[PDB]
Design a protein around this ligand. Structure first.
Ligand SMILES: [K+]
Ligand SMILES: [K+]
Ligand SMILES: [K+]
Ligand SMILES: [K+]
Ligand SMILES: [Mg+2]
Ligand SMILES: [Mg+2]
Ligand SMILES: [Mg+2]
Ligand SMILES: [Mg+2]
Ligand SMILES: [Mg+2]
Ligand SMILES: [Mg+2]
Ligand SMILES: [Mg+2]
Ligand SMILES: [Mg+2]
Ligand SMILES: [Mg+2]
Ligand SMILES: [Mg+2]
Ligand SMILES: [Mg+2]
Ligand SMILES: [Mg+2]
Ligand SMILES: [Mg+2]
Ligand SMILES: [Mg+2]
Ligand SMILES: [Mg+2]
Ligand SMILES: [Mg+2]
Ligand SMILES: [Mg+2]
Ligand SMILES: [Mg+2]
Ligand SMILES: [Mg+2]
Ligand SMILES: [Mg+2]
Ligand SMILES: [Mg+2]
Ligand SMILES: [Mg+2]
Ligand SMILES: [Mg+2]
Ligand SMILES: [Mg+2]
Ligand SMILES: [Mg+2]
Ligand SMILES: [Mg+2]
Ligand SMILES: [Mg+2]
Ligand SMILES: [Mg+2]
Ligand SMILES: [Mg+2]
Ligand SMILES: [Mg+2]
Ligand SMILES: [Mg+2]
Ligand SMILES: [Mg+2]
Ligand SMILES: [Mg+2]
Ligand SMILES: [Mg+2]
Ligand SMILES: [Mg+2]
Ligand SMILES: [Mg+2]
Ligand SMILES: [Mg+2]
Ligand SMILES: [Mg+2]
Ligand SMILES: [Mg+2]
Ligand SMILES: [Mg+2]
Ligand SMILES: [Mg+2]
Ligand SMILES: [Mg+2]
Ligand SMILES: [Mg+2]
Ligand SMILES: [Mg+2]
Ligand SMILES: [Mg+2]
Ligand SMILES: [Mg+2]
Ligand SMILES: [Mg+2]
Lengths: 101, 119, 73, 88
RNA sequence: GUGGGAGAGGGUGGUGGAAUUCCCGGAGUAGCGGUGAAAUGCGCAGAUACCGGGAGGAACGCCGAUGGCGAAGGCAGCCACCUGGUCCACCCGUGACGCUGAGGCGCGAAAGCGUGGGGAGCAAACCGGAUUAGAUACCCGGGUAGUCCACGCCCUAAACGAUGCGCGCUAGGUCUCUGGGUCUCCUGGGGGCCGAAGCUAACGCGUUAAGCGCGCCGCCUGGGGAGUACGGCCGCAAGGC
């Protein structure tokens, strides 16, 4: 049971129904691996620094969660099956290291 | 005969030859030139003067398509890059921006023995 | 000698481990997508070491560039 | 890994008295726990030699501590081996 | 033990972008490439240069350093999991449980061997072009094993600090990595430079000793013959001790 952060960049050209379906599958997959969500920050469509999947923009989602470690990798794979999902990065949570304080 | 009137100018400069390809804003070429298009045959192509001649020749060929403004793009380190730059700069063609976009790898492939002692 | 300005001195309070804060990490990159050296950032060894990996994360996410093109040569 | 609760469990289970955290029995028990965990890690990932060296060092340390206990008080030695099931 | 810390330490899975090559398409024309100069080569079956798309293999630019880690070899994109070592603070626990280490056992760059796979770039041998008095070379165009992966062998090296390990003692200054603290600075561990005493044939070493001491192991006894012969052990072989 460790605390992680999930960054999900998906297709910005999805309508509200397709986006709702993708987020539904994301939530269902999080429940299927026992990932208790603590907070969420939906930033949405943002301008990429380089084209990803031939698209200059991407829809960003972020989830701070807590889940068993042994299946973390096994969860990331499950999130890469959807073609609309194009970037999945899970990072162990870390305390902020402030500079120029 | 397309009457592009505005495009890009790629300069490929190596220690052996300098070759200028003038393209449209989408990258499709229109005309081009090099040290071999001019009478120079051997090592005289890797000469800044030969690069100037190639740039001016490609520019005059682009005048046939009625092009006025260009966007210069430089690739490769070779004697004659800056000479081709100054040739295109004052040739009737308006130079809007010069950009060096030399393809540098992130240490992917192994060079030939000529370029070793590095990665 | 890089006497123009230090990126840290030209900045305030910020998190060095936040890979999502793009507007602050843009300052630590050069004109190209390259990571600025110590003489330009003015950070310490530990600070620069953390900044490097956070910048790499931001690049992989598609926020920061891997490489850019030089202009006005 | 080896969390703090398991470590305290085995320490309190092998403590000679309340408060003992560094007696020979406690050290041998902790080394045995680490050795079993590393052996489970080395059944899979059999190409990991750098950790295999640490396994060798832990085994040597446990053998030296058991030899000391054998020399001083063989009764606690036999009791420790009976509780932990070592030496085959 | 407790509480903190730094790290390219190792293994497994996944994943990112740049570039090379190749394929598809667009656009486009007389050469490209290469060198001291050239030629082989490739190009009218449309190359080079340019744009877009796709495949594949291999290596990780900036960060990056005179830096870090590891017992050594050695380790450099990112993420996760598994995992080794190590340092500091508290002065908490055991109570000499220590040091070294013939044998033994295991690890051990590159090259090399076996089986299977992979094969973009590079490239022994080899095919050519030059150079040359000749050129079994350097230079240029190709190119196989190999380099890569899995598993099993091989045990070598300028495997280098050409300096075995451990502990204690013996001026300092400066730079740096990493902790702790009354955070100008002090204290602990580590990486460099200059230097007290002292040592050294000299060069140089000098709290990271090559100084002063103690313990234990390894090794040397003029050069060639020769790391050869014989014998043994090991190895599929090359060959190693
Ligand atoms: K080093
Ligand atoms: K073969
Ligand atoms: K030797
Ligand atoms: K401090
Ligand atoms: Mg997908
Ligand atoms: Mg030439
Ligand atoms: Mg590592
Ligand atoms: Mg084609
Ligand atoms: Mg060719
Ligand atoms: Mg060919
Ligand atoms: Mg021909
Ligand atoms: Mg024809
Ligand atoms: Mg090509
Ligand atoms: Mg392409
Ligand atoms: Mg292929
Ligand atoms: Mg560097
Ligand atoms: Mg070290
Ligand atoms: Mg070395
Ligand atoms: Mg005490
Ligand atoms: Mg007592
Ligand atoms: Mg020892
Ligand atoms: Mg031995
Ligand atoms: Mg070997
Ligand atoms: Mg090898
Ligand atoms: Mg082989
Ligand atoms: Mg094979
Ligand atoms: Mg080749
Ligand atoms: Mg030849
Ligand atoms: Mg001669
Ligand atoms: Mg001749
Ligand atoms: Mg060759
Ligand atoms: Mg081939
Ligand atoms: Mg073979
Ligand atoms: Mg050396
Ligand atoms: Mg040595
Ligand atoms: Mg000698
Ligand atoms: Mg020493
Ligand atoms: Mg020191
Ligand atoms: Mg000195
Ligand atoms: Mg003196
Ligand atoms: Mg002297
Ligand atoms: Mg000493
Ligand atoms: Mg002799
Ligand atoms: Mg003799
Ligand atoms: Mg000899
Ligand atoms: Mg020999
Ligand atoms: Mg014999
Ligand atoms: Mg035999
Ligand atoms: Mg032979
Ligand atoms: Mg031979
Ligand atoms: Mg021999």
């Amino acid at each position: 049971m460790r605390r992680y952060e999930v960054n999900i960049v998906l297709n910005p050209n999805l309508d509200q129904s397709q986006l709702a379906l993708e987020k539904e599958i994301i939530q269902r997959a999080l429940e299927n691996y026992g990932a208790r969500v603590e907070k969420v920050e939906e930033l949405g469509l943002r301008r990429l620094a380089y084209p990803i999947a031939k698209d200059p923009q991407g829809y960003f989602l972020w989830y701070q969660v807590e889940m068993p470690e042994d299946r973390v990798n096994d969860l990331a794979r499950e999130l890469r099956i959807r073609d609309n999902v194009r970037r999945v990065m899970v990072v162990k949570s870390q305390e902020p290291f402030l500079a120029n304080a | 005969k397309r009457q592009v009137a505005s495009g890009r100018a790629y300069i490929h400069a190596s220690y052996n030859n300098t070759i200028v390809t003038i393209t449209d804003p989408d990258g499709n070429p229109i005309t081009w030139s090099s040290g071999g298009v001019i009478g120079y045959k051997g090592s005289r192509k890797g000469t800044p003067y030969a690069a100037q001649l190639a740039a001016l020749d490609a520019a005059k060929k682009a005048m046939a398509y009625g092009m006025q403004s260009v966007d210069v793009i430089v690739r490769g380190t070779g004697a004659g890059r800056e000479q081709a730059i100054r040739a295109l700069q004052a040739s009737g063609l308006q130079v809007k921006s010069i950009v060096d976009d030399t393809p540098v790898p992130h240490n992917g492939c192994r060079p030939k023995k000529k370029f070793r002692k590095a990665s | 000698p890089s006497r123009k300005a230090k990126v840290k001195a030209t900045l305030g309070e910020f998190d060095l481990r936040d890979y999502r804060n793009v507007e602050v990490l843009k300052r630590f990159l050069s004109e190209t997508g390259k990571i600025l050296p110590r003489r330009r950032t003015g950070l310490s060894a530990k600070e620069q070491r953390i900044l490097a990996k956070t910048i790499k994360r931001a690049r992989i996410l598609g926020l920061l560039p891997f490489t850019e093109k030089l202009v006005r040569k | 890994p080896i969390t703090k609760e398991e470590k305290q469990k085995v320490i309190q289970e092998f403590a000679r008295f309340p408060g003992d955290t560094g007696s020979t029995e406690v050290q041998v028990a902790l080394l045995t726990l680490r050795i079993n965990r590393l052996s489970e890690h080395l059944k899979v990932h059999k190409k990991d030699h750098h950790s295999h060296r640490g396994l060798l060092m832990m085994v040597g340390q446990r053998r030296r501590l058991l030899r000391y206990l054998q020399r001083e008080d063989p009764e606690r030695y036999r009791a420790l081996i009976e509780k932990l099931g070592i030496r085959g």
